Design a protein around this motif. Structure first.
Motif, PDB file in Angstrom:
ATOM      1  N   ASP A   1       0.853  -1.173   0.000  1.00  0.00           N
ATOM      2  CA  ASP A   1       0.000   0.000   0.000  1.00  0.00           C
ATOM      3  C   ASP A   1       0.895   1.231   0.000  1.00  0.00           C
ATOM      4  O   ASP A   1       1.451   1.600   1.030  1.00  0.00           O
ATOM      5  CB  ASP A   1      -0.883  -0.042   1.251  1.00  0.00           C
ATOM      6  CG  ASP A   1      -1.823   1.150   1.360  1.00  0.00           C
ATOM      7  OD1 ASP A   1      -1.755   2.094   0.561  1.00  0.00           O
ATOM      8  OD2 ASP A   1      -2.642   1.146   2.288  1.00  0.00           O
TER       9      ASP A   1
ATOM     10  N   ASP B   1      -6.275   4.170   6.308  1.00  0.00           N
ATOM     11  CA  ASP B   1      -6.622   2.951   7.050  1.00  0.00           C
ATOM     12  C   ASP B   1      -8.057   3.104   7.584  1.00  0.00           C
ATOM     13  O   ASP B   1      -8.791   2.122   7.708  1.00  0.00           O
ATOM     14  CB  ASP B   1      -5.686   2.764   8.249  1.00  0.00           C
ATOM     15  CG  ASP B   1      -4.291   2.326   7.839  1.00  0.00           C
ATOM     16  OD1 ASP B   1      -4.157   1.672   6.798  1.00  0.00           O
ATOM     17  OD2 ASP B   1      -3.329   2.627   8.582  1.00  0.00           O
TER      18      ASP B   1
ATOM     19  N   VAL C   1      -5.459  -2.988   2.800  1.00  0.00           N
ATOM     20  CA  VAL C   1      -4.147  -3.194   3.384  1.00  0.00           C
ATOM     21  C   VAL C   1      -3.899  -2.218   4.533  1.00  0.00           C
ATOM     22  O   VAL C   1      -4.068  -0.983   4.389  1.00  0.00           O
ATOM     23  CB  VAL C   1      -3.026  -3.021   2.328  1.00  0.00           C
ATOM     24  CG1 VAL C   1      -1.650  -3.275   2.977  1.00  0.00           C
ATOM     25  CG2 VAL C   1      -3.253  -3.970   1.150  1.00  0.00           C
ATOM     26  N   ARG C   2      -3.456  -2.746   5.664  1.00  0.00           N
ATOM     27  CA  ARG C   2      -3.134  -1.918   6.806  1.00  0.00           C
ATOM     28  C   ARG C   2      -1.948  -2.561   7.529  1.00  0.00           C
ATOM     29  O   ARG C   2      -1.690  -3.759   7.368  1.00  0.00           O
ATOM     30  CB  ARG C   2      -4.340  -1.794   7.748  1.00  0.00           C
ATOM     31  CG  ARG C   2      -4.764  -3.094   8.384  1.00  0.00           C
ATOM     32  CD  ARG C   2      -5.949  -2.880   9.324  1.00  0.00           C
ATOM     33  NE  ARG C   2      -6.239  -4.112  10.049  1.00  0.00           N
ATOM     34  CZ  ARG C   2      -6.977  -5.109   9.572  1.00  0.00           C
ATOM     35  NH1 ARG C   2      -7.600  -4.993   8.409  1.00  0.00           N
ATOM     36  NH2 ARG C   2      -7.160  -6.199  10.300  1.00  0.00           N
TER      37      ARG C   2
ATOM     38  N   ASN D   1      -3.465   5.272   9.798  1.00  0.00           N
ATOM     39  CA  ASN D   1      -3.160   6.463   9.040  1.00  0.00           C
ATOM     40  C   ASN D   1      -4.527   6.858   8.413  1.00  0.00           C
ATOM     41  O   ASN D   1      -5.531   6.141   8.564  1.00  0.00           O
ATOM     42  CB  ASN D   1      -2.044   6.253   7.995  1.00  0.00           C
ATOM     43  CG  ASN D   1      -2.394   5.229   6.942  1.00  0.00           C
ATOM     44  OD1 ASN D   1      -3.507   5.208   6.404  1.00  0.00           O
ATOM     45  ND2 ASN D   1      -1.414   4.392   6.589  1.00  0.00           N
TER      46      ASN D   1
ATOM     47  N   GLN E   1      -8.437   1.466   3.268  1.00  0.00           N
ATOM     48  CA  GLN E   1      -7.662   1.693   2.039  1.00  0.00           C
ATOM     49  C   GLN E   1      -6.150   1.661   2.332  1.00  0.00           C
ATOM     50  O   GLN E   1      -5.728   1.832   3.484  1.00  0.00           O
ATOM     51  CB  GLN E   1      -8.049   3.053   1.445  1.00  0.00           C
ATOM     52  CG  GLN E   1      -9.496   3.133   0.953  1.00  0.00           C
ATOM     53  CD  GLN E   1      -9.670   2.490  -0.411  1.00  0.00           C
ATOM     54  OE1 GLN E   1      -8.839   1.681  -0.838  1.00  0.00           O
ATOM     55  NE2 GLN E   1     -10.733   2.862  -1.111  1.00  0.00           N
ATOM     56  N   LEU E   2      -5.316   1.426   1.321  1.00  0.00           N
ATOM     57  CA  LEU E   2      -5.735   1.059  -0.029  1.00  0.00           C
ATOM     58  C   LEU E   2      -5.984  -0.446  -0.180  1.00  0.00           C
ATOM     59  O   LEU E   2      -5.153  -1.274   0.212  1.00  0.00           O
ATOM     60  CB  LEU E   2      -4.677   1.516  -1.054  1.00  0.00           C
ATOM     61  CG  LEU E   2      -4.521   3.029  -1.257  1.00  0.00           C
ATOM     62  CD1 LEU E   2      -3.286   3.344  -2.101  1.00  0.00           C
ATOM     63  CD2 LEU E   2      -5.796   3.589  -1.913  1.00  0.00           C
TER      64      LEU E   2
ATOM     65  N   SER F   1       0.208   4.268   0.150  1.00  0.00           N
ATOM     66  CA  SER F   1      -0.203   5.368   1.012  1.00  0.00           C
ATOM     67  C   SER F   1       0.378   5.252   2.425  1.00  0.00           C
ATOM     68  O   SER F   1       0.435   6.245   3.143  1.00  0.00           O
ATOM     69  CB  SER F   1      -1.737   5.509   1.063  1.00  0.00           C
ATOM     70  OG  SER F   1      -2.334   4.485   1.837  1.00  0.00           O
TER      71      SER F   1
HETATM   72 CA   LIG Z   1      -3.643   1.266   4.476  1.00  0.00          CA
END
Ligand SMILES: [Ca+2]
Length: 319
Positions: free
Chosen positions: A241, A287, A295-296, A284, A291-292, A243
């Motif tokens: 991810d 999260d 995925v975290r 974040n 997203q994305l 981001s």
């Molecule tokens: Ca994420």
């Protein structure tokens, strides 16, 4: 089952750059509508300008009010539960302020009620162009991005208005124009009341914030941060991810602008509203909306489960 079956329909309200589905393919609220619906909830996902102010005739607030009315007509309901992410929370506040009879609750997730130091930063960067041509060129790129990614190719995009709206100075003005019992005193880092009543209308107010980005070291006037959502360095979220690292980067600018703990673009203090359910989530900004693509980091709580549990909380509260 009916675990998430609220009395009033839930309208999920996106923030900056948003739409219900990017290019009509990627749900902004990733996997959230389906999860809630599977647990018996009536859920609608707003599709508003990704770039605009919340107030104003062309603003996101009037767009959301119009949408709320179509949802009420379609369901036969008299009120809705507004759940907004980021700027979506400010849009939700506008609707609760101008049409209290149509709202039962307002829940804000990572919403910059007091603005964003990152928006202040971006605005300031634009001011360093002596010719001012970058404001025009970059705004045009961003406005086009908004029209192209909007699920309905909504041409009402105003990147500069969106940027101004999210600054700390402008958010303070917004709060004076659209006050709420759920907001505490400016500069106090406090929330307000858990409910607001105008005439015969009572709104249940809630909020939560992600505080993955923590200031952890200060050297030579420079503050370094740590992304607590991840296992240091090795977390697959940093790979899968983009981001994750991006928000750690913006989150670093945030802490160096005196924001304190944040989700990458919204400080804990800025996110406080109504009944603050939590500001401890190691999340974040993205999260917060799963997203994305779900995925975290390894230390990040499940956002799908948090939103679902909240739908049940709303059900138990009578809305
Ligand atoms: Ca994420």
């Amino acid at each position: 089952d009916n675990y998430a079956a609220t009395r009033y329909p839930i309208i999920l309200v996106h923030g900056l750059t948003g739409t219900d589905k990017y290019a009509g393919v990627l749900e902004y609220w990733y996997g959230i509508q389906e999860d809630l619906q599977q647990r018996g909830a009536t859920v609608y996902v707003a599709n508003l300008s990704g770039f605009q102010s919340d107030d104003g005739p062309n603003g996101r607030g009037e767009q959301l009010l119009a949408y709320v009315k179509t949802v009420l007509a379609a369901t036969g309901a008299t009120k809705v539960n507004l759940v907004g992410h980021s700027q979506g929370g400010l849009t939700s506040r506008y609707v609760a302020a101008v049409a209290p009879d149509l709202v039962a609750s307002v829940t804000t997730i990572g919403t910059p009620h007091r603005g964003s130091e990152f928006a202040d930063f971006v605005q300031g960067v634009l001011a360093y162009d002596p010719t001012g041509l970058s404001s025009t060129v970059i705004a045009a790129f961003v406005n086009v991005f908004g029209i192209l990614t909007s699920s309905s190719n909504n041409t009402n995009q105003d990147a500069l208005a969106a940027l101004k709206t999210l600054t700390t100075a402008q958010a303070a003005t917004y709060n004076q124009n659209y006050p709420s019992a759920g907001l505490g005193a400016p500069g106090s880092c406090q929330t307000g009341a858990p409910t607001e009543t105008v005439g015969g209308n009572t709104h249940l107010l809630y909020s939560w914030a992600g505080t993955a980005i923590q200031p952890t070291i200060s050297v030579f006037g420079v503050t370094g941060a740590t992304d607590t959502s991840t296992i240091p360095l090795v977390d697959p979220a940093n790979a899968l991810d983009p981001s994750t690292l991006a928000l750690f980067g913006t989150g670093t600018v945030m802490v160096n602008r005196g924001s304190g703990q944040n989700d990458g673009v919204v400080s804990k203090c800025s996110a406080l509203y109504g009944q603050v359910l939590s500001t401890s989530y190691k999340w974040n900004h993205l999260d917060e909306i799963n997203q994305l693509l779900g995925v975290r980091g390894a230390n990040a709580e499940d956002p799908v489960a948090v939103i679902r549990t909240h739908a049940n909380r709303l059900k138990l509260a009578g809305v």
